[PDB]
Amino acid sequence: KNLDCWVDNEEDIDVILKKSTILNLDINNDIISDISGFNSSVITYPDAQLVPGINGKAIHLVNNESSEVIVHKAMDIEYNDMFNNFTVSFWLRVPKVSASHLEQYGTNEYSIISSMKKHSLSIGSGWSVSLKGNNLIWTLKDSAGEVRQITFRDLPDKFNAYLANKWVFITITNDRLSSANLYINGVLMGSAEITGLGAIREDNNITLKLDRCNNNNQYVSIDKFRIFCKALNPKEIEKLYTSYLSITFLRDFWGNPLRYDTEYYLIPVASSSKDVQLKNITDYMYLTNAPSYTNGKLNIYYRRLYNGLKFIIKRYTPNNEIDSFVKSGDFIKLYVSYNNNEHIVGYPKDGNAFNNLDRILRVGYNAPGIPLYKKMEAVKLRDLKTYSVQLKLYDDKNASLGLVGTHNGQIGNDPNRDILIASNWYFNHLKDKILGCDWYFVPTDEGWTND
Numbered sequence: 001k002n003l004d005c006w007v008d009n010e011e012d013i014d015v016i017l018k019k020s021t022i023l024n025l026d027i028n029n030d031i032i033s034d035i036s037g038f039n040s041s042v043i044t045y046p047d048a049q050l051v052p053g054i055n056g057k058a059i060h061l062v063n064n065e066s067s068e069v070i071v072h073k074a075m076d077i078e079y080n081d082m083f084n085n086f087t088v089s090f091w092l093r094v095p096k097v098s099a100s101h102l103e104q105y106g107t108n109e110y111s112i113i114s115s116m117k118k119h120s121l122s123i124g125s126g127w128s129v130s131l132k133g134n135n136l137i138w139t140l141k142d143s144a145g146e147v148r149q150i151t152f153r154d155l156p157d158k159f160n161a162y163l164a165n166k167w168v169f170i171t172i173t174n175d176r177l178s179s180a181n182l183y184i185n186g187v188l189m190g191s192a193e194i195t196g197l198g199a200i201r202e203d204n205n206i207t208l209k210l211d212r213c214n215n216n217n218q219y220v221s222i223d224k225f226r227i228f229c230k231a232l233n234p235k236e237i238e239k240l241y242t243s244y245l246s247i248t249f250l251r252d253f254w255g256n257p258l259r260y261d262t263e264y265y266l267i268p269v270a271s272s273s274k275d276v277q278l279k280n281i282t283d284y285m286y287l288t289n290a291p292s293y294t295n296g297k298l299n300i301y302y303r304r305l306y307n308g309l310k311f312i313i314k315r316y317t318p319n320n321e322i323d324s325f326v327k328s329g330d331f332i333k334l335y336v337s338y339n340n341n342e343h344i345v346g347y348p349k350d351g352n353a354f355n356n357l358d359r360i361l362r363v364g365y366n367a368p369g370i371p372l373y374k375k376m377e378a379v380k381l382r383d384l385k386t387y388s389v390q391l392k393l394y395d396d397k398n399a400s401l402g403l404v405g406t407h408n409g410q411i412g413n414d415p416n417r418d419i420l421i422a423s424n425w426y427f428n429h430l431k432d433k434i435l436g437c438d439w440y441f442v443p444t445d446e447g448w449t450n451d
């Protein structure tokens with residue numbers, strides 16, 4: 001018998017998952033508690049705040065001694081990790097670090113989560129999760145003081161990286177016979193042999209807090225903090241990852257829930273370096289290259305954000321008391337905000353259409369008495385793991401005018417352009433890996449500022 005816990009029946013993955021869970025932090029009605037089944041006190045200090053999460057509110061930590069969350073483990077699950085296998089998982093959101101902060105604070109390692117033995121004059125064995133610039137570190141120290149680490153260096157392209165302001169899922173497995181393995185969003189990101197380490201008792205406390213960080217602006221966000229009593233297999237890591245990916249409220253680009261009456265810049269997943277722009281009022285919209293920021297000495301670059309048109313989302317039919325969140329299947333109206341005026345986005349009756357099937361959207365098209373088709377459904381049709389959205393346009397008899405996307409061509413006498421359209425064409429390509437109808441909604445956020 002080895003180190004993974006209770007073994008009986010070969011059952012569902014979902015069963016194994018629950019039956020090997022030893023701590024599980026959920027947040028409900030603003031209380032942070034453990035729902036694993038065991039009880040473990042969770043003490044929330046005065047300055048540990050709460051923010052929009054992946055499936056409810058999540059824990060937010062700033063850089064002062066008041067911003068902390070501690071779990072005292074129950075006397076049942078208090079040994080476990082001494083010579084045993086274990087797995088740690090959590091969702092994490094770390095803002096994008098400015099080029100000044102990297103110049104200044106890039107070599108500064110500091111803890112965010114840990115459980116390491118509290119001694120009279122020192123600190124002993126256990127584990128820690130920490131960060132250093134744009135690197136994510138996992139650390140193990142045994143009783144003899146021997147150390148093994150996993151250091152993951154994030155991607156230089158910040159529009160696509162894991163440590164640059166979107167929600168990402170972290171999972172870390174430990175097999176005291178082969179290895180420590182780090183995964184991000186279900187994909188093995190690095191590893192380390194831990195054969196030869198001895199005892200790893202752990203402190204009776206698990207501390208969530210910023211420790212030894214020299215930057216008083218740094219902050220992180222953490223959610224569903226969870227511990228298993230075994231080393232999870234790749235299959236199980238995956239079912240755990242998507243179990244959180246409920247479909248009901250849509251998501252903006254950072255992976256927070258989508259909202260009505262708030263400004264968003266659109267970016268097509270298929271060409272993430274173009275922004276959307278406007279020909280003229282009553283006219284159409286087309287794509288253009290976004291300006292970029294690059295800094296080879298710091299090892300960083302990205303397409304810049306916040307240029308283009310600002311879109312706003314309104315309930316097709318007015319609410320009554322209701323939430324501000326947009327669910328999938330929700331029918332909305334889509335406006336463009338330009339020159340202190342809001343113009344509706346839509347398609348008219350016998351308006352221009354590449355090959356009479358791809359209808360070219362117009363912004364604020366007004367006319368005598370000419371039907372302007374604007375009813376849209378905002379849904380998630382594909383690619384669960386990506387914070388993207390699809391828009392379906394209807395006409396006045398509830399027929400499909402199709403999905404919002406783009407098609408290349410050339411109007412009047414402007415130059416060739418990728419122009420915005422609606423067509424039922426996408427409906428036959430839904431299984432492609434990349435597809436021109438997937439869109440990102442991007443709001444201004446304090447965690448991403450352009451250099």
Ligand SMILES: CC(=O)N[C@H]1[C@H](O[C@@H]2[C@H](O[C@@]3(C(=O)O)C[C@H](O)[C@@H](NC(C)=O)[C@H]([C@H](O)[C@@H](CO)O[C@]4(C(=O)O)C[C@H](O)[C@@H](NC(C)=O)[C@H]([C@H](O)[C@H](O)CO)O4)O3)[C@@H](O)[C@H](O[C@H]3[C@H](O)[C@@H](O)[C@H](OCC[Si](C)(C)C)O[C@@H]3CO)O[C@@H]2CO)O[C@H](CO)[C@H](O)[C@@H]1O[C@@H]1O[C@H](CO)[C@H](O)[C@H](O[C@]2(C(=O)O)C[C@H](O)[C@@H](NC(C)=O)[C@H]([C@H](O)[C@H](O)CO)O2)[C@H]1O
Nearest residue numbers: 270354355357358405406407408421423425429432435436
């Ligand atoms: C314009 C177009 O290609 N597709 C629109 C579509 O068109 C047709 C038609 O093509 C059809 C078709 O899809 O409907 C039908 C046709 O019978 C077949 N041909 C054959 C024999 O298979 C083609 C075929 O499937 C294609 C794909 O188009 O074939 C090749 C090919 O020809 O061999 C494959 C080859 O690798 C390609 N090479 C390239 C360019 O890299 C070529 C190439 O794309 C074209 O050959 C050159 O443009 O395609 O599919 C038309 O061929 C046909 O054309 C008429 C012509 O218009 C007319 O003037 C002519 O008159 C006659 C001669 Si005369 C007057 C001198 C005597 O008659 C010909 C023949 O009839 O017209 C058809 C209907 O009018 O129609 C739909 C309708 O809704 C759309 O408009 C299609 O365009 C797509 O629109 C979308 C939304 O509007 C998107 O923008 C698509 O674009 C992306 C995307 O998914 O977003 C853009 C991405 O960057 C791109 N990434 C890549 C490269 O991977 C993707 C990618 O293409 C796909 O995602 C792969 O899945 O597309 C638009 O494509």
